[PDB]
Amino acid sequence: ELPRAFGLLLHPTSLPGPYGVGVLGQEARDFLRFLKEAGGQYWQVLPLGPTGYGDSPYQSFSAFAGNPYLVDLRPLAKRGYVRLEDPGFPQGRVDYGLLYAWKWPALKEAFRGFQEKAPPEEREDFAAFREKEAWWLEDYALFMALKGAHGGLPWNRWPLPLRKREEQALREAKSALAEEVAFHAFTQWLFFRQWGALKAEAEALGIRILGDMPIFVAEDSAEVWAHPEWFHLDEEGRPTVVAGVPPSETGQRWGNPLYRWDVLEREGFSFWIRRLEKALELFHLVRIDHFRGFEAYWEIPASCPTAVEGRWVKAPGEKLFQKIQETFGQVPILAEDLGVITPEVEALRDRFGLPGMKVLQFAFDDGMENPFLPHNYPSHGRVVVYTGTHDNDTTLGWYRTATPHEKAFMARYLADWGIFFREEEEVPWALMRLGMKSVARLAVYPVQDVLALGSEARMNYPGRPSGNWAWRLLPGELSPEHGERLRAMAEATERL
């Protein structure tokens, strides 16, 4: 049963620090301390898998793998395994192109330095790690090695014996890319080691990490390559059908491969169990995006170019949750239940006592019936209230672009709830207060709203080709005063 509490949303890439990206190092511990001192008990992150073109966490090369960019290199550099220099990284922003060019070589150099110089004790735990994680790691490491060797081409575009995973081809590829396979394995060992320490620190400080996973994996991913039967795939490995959302007047065609649920059901939903178990190592709770898919999913033929063409298909959510509940003794899922929802989807979520999402930015476009208005929140309180999501703008940016109706209805509503503001920079704080006063057990706020940043700090702008996933905190930006303001709000709203 969720405690009445508050959290902050921050993806690790946004953390401050050198070498062009936030890493699992001292700055992350600093953030946890701030979160602790501010009286927060929850840290939310976006997916932590390896990113492709477009740098999206929501399109990953592995469901299981950690992001190589989040690995801190400074512990290696202190050991003398690598020498790090700054190529001219921007501050307050991730430049992924510079990062791609510098970090991957940095990681390789570190690996070579480790293999030469590392103590045998270290080299044993790396060796022990590879054997333990082999069930996912072997394929991941090879998928990455093959990808570089095949010039970033998707696995669907690879030569056929490799694509179909014929044993001889697999064996010969591993021998040919054995140094590469070892390297990708090393990146993971570092990742899981560094996150394991970080999670330990959090737990000590009484902080639970909220993870994030998309319901659908990407087409260009190790698991899809590894287990094609699980996916609806043609002989070529091209999806016969693609994930999407029905008409959003156009609808949306995402392109993601859909699961052969029957196959998974036969298998006791093994992929999902493993996926969650791996997530639970990193996280305390796991939000699943497009959670509605578990009830039913919109199936679009791949040949069809638009979202309008497909059909709805029923999915065995009930069964999957029954298996989860029986395996873990619990269903540790936050349901992303935003957008068009059905009584069926609500039925499933409430059956497993799963908490749902609420977003305050959505709340003032309608009338008082609007579900995102606190008074309409369920009494059971199993909801996480957000000022905004990673796909939405910052609250201050939203307030600068919002309609006169929205702005007036908001001010009035706040006023009724006893919340007043004299400035637009105060608006994010007022909205944070509105969520804290609500019945919602958890209120999770992005750091950009704590800082009252404008639209320059938007994590993701849907429909914008560049500049996404790049926002970074500056060192020291999250001042003690910010923390003291949060703590006071939490005392006043009984979230301490």
Q: How many Cβ atoms are within 10 Å of 183's Cβ, its own excluded?
A: 22
Q: Which residues are catalytic?
A: 289, 336, 391
Task: Tell me if 263 sits within 8 A of 182, measured CB to CB.
Answer: no
Residue 142's alpha-carbon distances to 56, 115, 396, 430, in angstroms, are 22, 19, 45, 50
Amino acid present at 110: A
Contacting residues for 342 by C-beta, under 8 A, at least 6 apart: 292, 295, 296
Q: Which residues of 461-480 are buried (b: 16+ CB within 10 A; e: fewer)?
A: eeeeeeebbbbbbeeeebee
Residue that has been written with the tokens 């590469």 in this structure: 180
295: left (phi > 0), else alpha (psi -120 to 50), else beta?
A: alpha
Experimental method: X-ray
- 227 CA to centre of own chain: 23
User: Is the dihedral angle over the CA atoms 190, 194, 200, 202 positive or is it negative?
Assistant: negative
What is the resolution in angstroms? 2.1
With CA atoms as reference, report the closest residue to 6 among 489, 442, 384, 476.
442
